[PDB]
Amino acid sequence: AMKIVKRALTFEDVLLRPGYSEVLPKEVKIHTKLTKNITLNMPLISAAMDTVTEHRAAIMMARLGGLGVIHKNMDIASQVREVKRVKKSEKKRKEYPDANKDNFGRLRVGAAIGVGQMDRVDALVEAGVDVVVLDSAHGHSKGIIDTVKAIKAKYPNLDLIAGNIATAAAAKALCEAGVDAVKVGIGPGSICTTRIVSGVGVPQISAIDECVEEANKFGVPVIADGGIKYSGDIAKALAVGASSVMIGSLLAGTDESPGELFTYQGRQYKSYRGMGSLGAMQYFQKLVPEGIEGRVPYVGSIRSVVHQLLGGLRSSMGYVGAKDIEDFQKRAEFVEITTAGLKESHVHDVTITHEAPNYK
Amino acid sequence: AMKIVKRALTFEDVLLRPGYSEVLPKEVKIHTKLTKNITLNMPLISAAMDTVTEHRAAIMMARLGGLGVIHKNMDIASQVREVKRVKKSEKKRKEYPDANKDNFGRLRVGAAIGVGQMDRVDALVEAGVDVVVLDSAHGHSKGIIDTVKAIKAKYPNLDLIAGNIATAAAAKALCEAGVDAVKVGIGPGSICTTRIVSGVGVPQISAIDECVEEANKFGVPVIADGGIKYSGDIAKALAVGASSVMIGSLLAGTDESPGELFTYQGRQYKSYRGMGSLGAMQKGSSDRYFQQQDKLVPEGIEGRVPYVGSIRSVVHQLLGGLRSSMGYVGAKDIEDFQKRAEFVEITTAGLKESHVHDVTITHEAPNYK
Amino acid sequence: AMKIVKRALTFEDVLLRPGYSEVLPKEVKIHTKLTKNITLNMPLISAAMDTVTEHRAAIMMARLGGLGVIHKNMDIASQVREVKRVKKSEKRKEYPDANKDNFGRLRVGAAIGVGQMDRVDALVEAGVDVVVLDSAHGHSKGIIDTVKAIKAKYPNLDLIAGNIATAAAAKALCEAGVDAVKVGIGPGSICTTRIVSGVGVPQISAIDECVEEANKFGVPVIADGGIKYSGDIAKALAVGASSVMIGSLLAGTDESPGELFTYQGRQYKSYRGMGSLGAMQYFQKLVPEGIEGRVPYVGSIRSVVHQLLGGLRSSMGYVGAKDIEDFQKRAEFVEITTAGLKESHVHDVTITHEAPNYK
Amino acid sequence: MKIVKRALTFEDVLLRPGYSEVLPKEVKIHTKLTKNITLNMPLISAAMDTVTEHRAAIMMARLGGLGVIHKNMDIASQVREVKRVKKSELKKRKEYPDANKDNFGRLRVGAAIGVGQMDRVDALVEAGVDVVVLDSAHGHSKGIIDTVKAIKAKYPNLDLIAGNIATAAAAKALCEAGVDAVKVGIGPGSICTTRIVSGVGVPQISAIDECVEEANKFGVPVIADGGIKYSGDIAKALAVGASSVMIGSLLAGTDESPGELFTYQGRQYKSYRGMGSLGAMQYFQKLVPEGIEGRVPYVGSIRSVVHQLLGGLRSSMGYVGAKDIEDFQKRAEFVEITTAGLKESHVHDVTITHEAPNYKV
């Protein structure tokens, strides 16, 4: 007989219950840990995708207190220049008071690498990257683990994120190899077809839950990567135990993402594509892709998007009565809902006529 | 691991079973308690929203036996005038025989307040408001509870509704603070985005059930607020234990609601918007507490509903559906309805079967869309 | 806490499992009981609706082995005339499964409401075979008192009573002496009872519960409403119903009352709830429990019935059942998911030809 | 009422990732068609008159799988199709290195028959057919069982597939009659209306699981037939224990399928219809059909489609850590998901602007 080990839930399946609150949303603290050694002033990371994060997006994310991860779909020299552009970026101290800086006052930045890319690691380390994001479609693999061990052997103090994973066994294996954070998410991304092409993945809320429980044993933070559609999803991912959230599609239509605006029938758009899409590909992986190429609406500045996102997170913590993220995770109580309950939660039986800044 | 405490249901998840019946829908009694000390002659309240209830909707809701709550997105002077217009409203006794009146034969009216607005309470009391509705996005908060206590210490005989809540613990805290009713609903409203932007909420049927079980220990009525789409939802909310129902979207397209009619492509509409939408908050009379750098993060949207005619015509269909439900259950009145009610949980397929299906509608029914 | 007594299923929630079969669809037998005393040669009844059944539809339903129930949305004189037109209709080699009474006349049913004893008298005098006591809520004092007064006056008049959806209701009607119960609160295509009133029971679970109770009295169950496809007929009978009442699938036929009309190059006929405004203009300005609509024109009743009964025969062959009783003894269901339902329908292909039994 | 189980199909479940030391390009995808016939990849083109005649069967065999010639033709014509495949086979050796060949280096081919068609069996055997596919709407029937026994009595070494079935009891009865594989699927096909017209069927993932557990007792492979819409479905069907997968709709719009292209509103299509549709019909079964007639987009060559399907299977096995199909089945662990989780799995909150070769909405 077939082994079903779990009925797995994702964001749309659950809601947080309200709790007794003595805190206002404006007063809660949203600092969190990116890795064992790197703190964020707010829990958002822009994805390592060639339509989301290069130096300009990374700079704004760091200025607002989070982080950008420079994607690796470029040569080593180019990715070094991108990292250097962020590090050398820093009126602003009054303007961006929550900026996420290293010990020398420089904006923090991350950069993506792949299996076996030690040459790329050497050059990113030399450029002053704060953290390396070892990215694979399948982080629970010999290639990833061997790469973790080689990097730690050469750079014992380099903070290392590794992913992506979706199981406790994967979290345990990466933590035992010495990673400083695990990135959780197999298939949930907006542009991702891994689950359809390969049949493989875990609904994101259950994946986070399972991996947090294992990673917590090692004191290792979890990055919840992909499938975030609304500010409420950020709140749910953090409440179940993730320490930070990686976001692609919500940031790809911003001014600061790479690529130019274009108009299609009166409305403005920006391209957004999977890094496993055919166009992006022009270790683990004619090509058989695991992502699509598409477009998202133009939404203005990263700052305006992040403001709405973090405001939804602050409202959530106020509803739960939480003074900060760890208290949020201690207090969090979830309810499983039905499709009808989801219909009820969205706007219904009313035709929207003005665009809400945080709801589409 | 993550703590899931229950699987929660809302209206479309459940149906009432029919029972043995000796009563006709036209004979059942639909009087109910608004608060510990205020009865209604029918169980409907119009929402405290600036596209639903000012004096004219409140007058009609009370004349038909229910209640309107004047919204608070206006200065104190204006809200006082709205309350006084309702109080001074009163052939009509033959015309509206179920009118909901105070001890002096005046139509009853409620008015919304926010946290820490004691000046507004003072002036509404002087204007003769029958009940104050202390509304917050999060009623289970120190600010709300401190306001309950300060109002009761100053006005021990003022009936007080406090909300919104969705848990038994919240109902217990408000009841222990001395409220006269609790209002239940976090997120279910037609225009509401709380559950999506914040991730927080409880499906409305389970929230009523859980809050009724707690509030009943204190003899405190529950107002089921938000998410009502059809008259059958009113029946389910009352059957599961709510004493009354607050309705926004279904009343927003009426003659009596504020705002003007407008035509959009051969059809008539009226605007309907959340009180936590941008457009509602941009007005400078919206003092906010829990919801309040620069730019606001809304919890609702701005939209339109079709024009539906008079409040009376809408209420007639709504109460007709409730009477039909009680007839199916065999219930002579609301309390009997709640004692007899038995539910079944249904699937999506069962929901599809319940609506109209496999037929193209060509005439518009007054109670189904 | 709220009393949820069960999680109730309807047709689309379940499938029949195939079983070992030594019978071909063309040789299974589909005779069944309408009442304790009236047999059918096939298990279909046309609904008592003023867009479905008057004499012409009832004649064709009886000729094909089933039954029509003349609706009651007419004065007593006209319903009498409609019953007589069926009774005096009579072809024998053309309709060899015709459902006839002891004198070789086509069987017919007629609907009545609470308290309509004058109507019952006249229908009895016209030779009606079975009276269908119809109410939105059959589990009521008014219905039960009408059952007892009819049986007191006409002890041998076969009587159907409904509609019900619970075992308690089935028990009460059987204890009053009905000859069949009609099950269905809300499932009808044109019905809004469940939306307007919040009341109803998903139809597969309602049949199952009522059949288990009615069987104790030897009383057949009529499964009324919600039938979309021939497979729904198979499920309803397999779960234990003795017969099936159908509205929307027969409203588009030549024989149903009403003119064909054309709307944008296609042909339609009206189909409306009997609790809709249009139809209404005991238990029930009016607050309706149904809508007024249209269904596509589908040709003759005979062509529709042929496809419906072919699906039933196919089902019984899949299960290995020689006849209806055997079908009900062999029947095993699986509950399926939404994905399983999607997989069951036609998927990932654009249909280019209209199938006679699927849309 | 007797509800035996809550039955799931493909979209209800996902495979969990596992620890992996193998790359998708290195896994092995050979499998058993029958007790006696091997495949070099697990795909079979369906026995449908819009999917498989000689040209599609040649390509399926050249790529390592199999084609089953449909039986909607007289015996002479089906013999012609079978020997056209058998006679199809130096630069081809380098071109098709995974070709599925018999003991004499000829491409393998299957052919479909119905109940009581012993004349047709005689002529297919004489034409050198490798395997006969006894196909019925209801394989768990006296007619099918008696036909199995009569074919084995006359041709003891003729490999015989029989179907379709969806229960463990049906798998047991066929295996006890001596079949060499069972074909599983009652109702899941893209064009099929069996479940709607008859009310009968089992969601395909549970049907495979149930039938594999029984057939494994007899060492008999299971062919998962119908309902495949994406390469991940192939992976799930195999991981739950099927030995091979039969595909119709995904191959009907190819160059090699019968029927020519036709343009409809600036796009190219091919016809695809159930073999129980009215058009295809014009033992078990005016006619009452169990299928529809429709069209599918034109997708180019079979080879291109198969390449994407097999790449999805390889990616799946790499995610699970499986070196081959048997190991894939030993390692496989599923989660049940919700419709929300299904929505999350597909592309969401992005409008697709370029068509992926292996994904369509």
Ligand SMILES: N/C=N\c1c(C(=O)O)ncn1[C@@H]1O[C@H](COP(=O)(O)O)[C@@H](O)[C@H]1O
């Ligand atoms: N392999 C599945 N997905 C891909 C693909 C692809 O397959 O082509 N390229 C990126 N990803 C993931 O998607 C996330 C963003 O997700 P989003 O915030 O837009 O929902 C990213 O952070 C990645 O973890």
Ligand SMILES: N/C=N\c1c(C(=O)O)ncn1[C@@H]1O[C@H](COP(=O)(O)O)[C@@H](O)[C@H]1O
């Ligand atoms: N925060 C969620 N909802 C809001 C919003 C908003 O979001 O901005 N403004 C009002 N509400 C609630 O909605 C009910 C009406 O609901 P309805 O009858 O239309 O279903 C009202 O009675 C309020 O309780």
Ligand SMILES: N/C=N\c1c(C(=O)O)ncn1[C@@H]1O[C@H](COP(=O)(O)O)[C@@H](O)[C@H]1O
């Ligand atoms: N009260 C709910 N429904 C009504 C209505 C109405 O609502 O106005 N008038 C008839 N009915 C029922 O519907 C069946 C047909 O169902 P169908 O075969 O079309 O699915 C009939 O046999 C009736 O039992």
Ligand SMILES: N/C=N\c1c(C(=O)O)ncn1[C@@H]1O[C@H](COP(=O)(O)O)[C@@H](O)[C@H]1O
């Ligand atoms: N009886 C249900 N279906 C039929 C029909 C029909 O009834 O008309 N003719 C073929 N089938 C099945 O469909 C599969 C293809 O399925 P697909 O790959 O397109 O999803 C075929 O391999 C058959 O097993």
Ligand SMILES: [Cl-]
């Ligand atoms: Cl730090």
Ligand SMILES: [Cl-]
């Ligand atoms: Cl700058």
Ligand SMILES: [Cl-]
């Ligand atoms: Cl490199």
Ligand SMILES: [Cl-]
């Ligand atoms: Cl800005």
Ligand SMILES: [Cl-]
């Ligand atoms: Cl104020």
Ligand SMILES: [Cl-]
């Ligand atoms: Cl008889």
Ligand SMILES: [Cl-]
């Ligand atoms: Cl669902």
Ligand SMILES: [Cl-]
């Ligand atoms: Cl071999």
Ligand SMILES: [Cl-]
């Ligand atoms: Cl032949």
Ligand SMILES: [Cl-]
């Ligand atoms: Cl090619």
Ligand SMILES: [K+]
């Ligand atoms: K809502």
Ligand SMILES: [K+]
């Ligand atoms: K209905």
